[PDB]
Design a protein around this ligand. Structure first.
Ligand SMILES: O=C(O)c1ccc(-c2nn(S(=O)(=O)c3ccccc3C(F)(F)F)c3ccc(Cl)cc23)c(OCc2ccccc2)c1
Lengths: 264, 261
């Protein structure tokens, strides 16, 4: 199908583009989280949150007065930013911009949720999550302690991330894996599935070789990573069901109509 | 890590046990569905009266209920066949007893829909050990919530069947599903994942030898476990609607235990 040297070329192409499109790489985030590097400002309670916004000025925690909502909303602000970074990255995947324009939009629409969850694990450990390009760190305990349903909104993301991180993928692995997710030929409404699965076949070959060369001791890591695509689809659907319960319950949630449109 | 000849021995073992455990194979089912055989033609059920004639030929309540009850009777039989097969998977019966139960609890339904695809084409499904064939249209036309019970299984089967797996492939794939270390409540994840590693190596080699032109079939088959998980969840939500609506309607004790939690 594809020759080994071409698969290495595709892997390197995707890695180079992944570094340019995403500001905070997994390699950099792990340096911050482990204490192996300007320590980030830590948000662990209500007062430290108040000081963090006053001193660091986090752009997702600014002008809807209740903290739990403010944080919940802040997460959606960052997610919308991440969609644009993922969209730019996808343009670098060989073949993608040659696809039918509606199919490109469909692949991004249904794939960004899975990729956001995947890449959020890079920024997490069992104790919290990096924010604002790594300058802040919000503790798991503070997040889980948010009232009513907002506390239980955050914890599932940590539970997935802890399991996903046990695979010990690095950025060069993740760049191919993210590409594989985007090129899923089973998204609803696709007009021309054939070139999408043709590209995914190439990407899967490149991921397989990448994993054997970069983790030669990690038996069947390729298979195990593919099994995580089950966890991703399952958690996205759960996430959707969680929002719908918020939307139908919480009357303090309204933003400026123009803001509501941006985050539709 | 395992040797090539050891992986071929494991595939042959599993295929052998699969033939012993499941009376209606994919190979037999396809001979029935494709026809050109006067000794294996099924009686076709497409409406009430042909169902009426079916009782006499294949051998007191509402039709949609009788059909539903029939599936649960067959589901219990399938759980029995699947449990027999699992005991033959090297290492399974050596596991902690609670884990054996847990793997079966969460695995039997994913396997049932996998092997049900073998009995399906786009127009209907074989029943009663291949003697009957019930049309998709007739099933979809059942009243209440029962009409929508089967259609998602058909939608999966049509896609899954496009992979063109045979029984020797499916024997390893089914084993991989059972030995899933991510089932909730498992006590000893590590020995389960050691077994699945061997099974995954064996499935990979099997697919390369038996489908050499079918690029990345291994990867594409594993992505199908996502479709399986979704169908189980849909089915469970349908049962709960039934439990709260049909209060004269009982489930088999074996089935009730599987669906608890
Ligand atoms: O930098 C990043 O790469 C980054 C990306 C995403 C998120 C985040 N998004 N969301 S989300 O809005 O629910 C959402 C929306 C659409 C689709 C998926 C999701 C989601 F999968 F993740 F669940 C979150 C919910 C909980 C948590 Cl802990 C994180 C997120 C992110 O959070 C950083 C953050 C944390 C606290 C306060 C402010 C910012 C960072």
């Amino acid at each position: 199908h594809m020759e080994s040297a071409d698969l290495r070329a595709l892997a390197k192409h995707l890695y180079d583009s992944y570094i340019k499109s995403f500001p905070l790489t997994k390699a950099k985030a792990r340096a911050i989280l482990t204490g192996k590097t300007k320590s980030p400002f830590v948000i662990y309670d209500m007062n430290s949150l108040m000081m963090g916004e006053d001193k660091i000025k986090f752009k997702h925690i600014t002008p809807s007065k209740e903290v739990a909502i403010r944080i919940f909303q802040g997460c959606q602000f960052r997610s919308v930013e991440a969609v644009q970074e993922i969209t730019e990255y996808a343009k670098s995947i060989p073949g993608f911009v040659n696809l039918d324009l509606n199919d490109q939009v469909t692949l991004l629409k249904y794939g960004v949720h899975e990729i956001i969850y995947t890449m959020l694990a890079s920024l997490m450990n069992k104790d919290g999550v990096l924010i604002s390009e790594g300058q802040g760190f919000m503790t798991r305990e503070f997040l889980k302690s948010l009232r009513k349903p907002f506390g239980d909104f955050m914890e599932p993301k940590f539970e997935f991330a802890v399991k996903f991180n046990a695979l010990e993928l690095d950025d060069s692995d993740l760049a191919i894996f993210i590409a594989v997710i985007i090129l899923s030929g089973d998204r609803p409404g696709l007009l021309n599935v054939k070139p999408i699965e043709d590209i995914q076949d190439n990407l899967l070959q490149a991921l397989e070789l990448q994993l054997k060369l970069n983790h030669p001791e990690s038996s069947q890591l390729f298979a195990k990573l593919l099994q995580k695509m089950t966890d991703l689809r399952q958690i996205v659907t759960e996430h959707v069901q969680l929002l719908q319960v918020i939307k139908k319950t919480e009357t303090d949630m309204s933003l400026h109509p123009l803001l509501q449109e941006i985050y539709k």
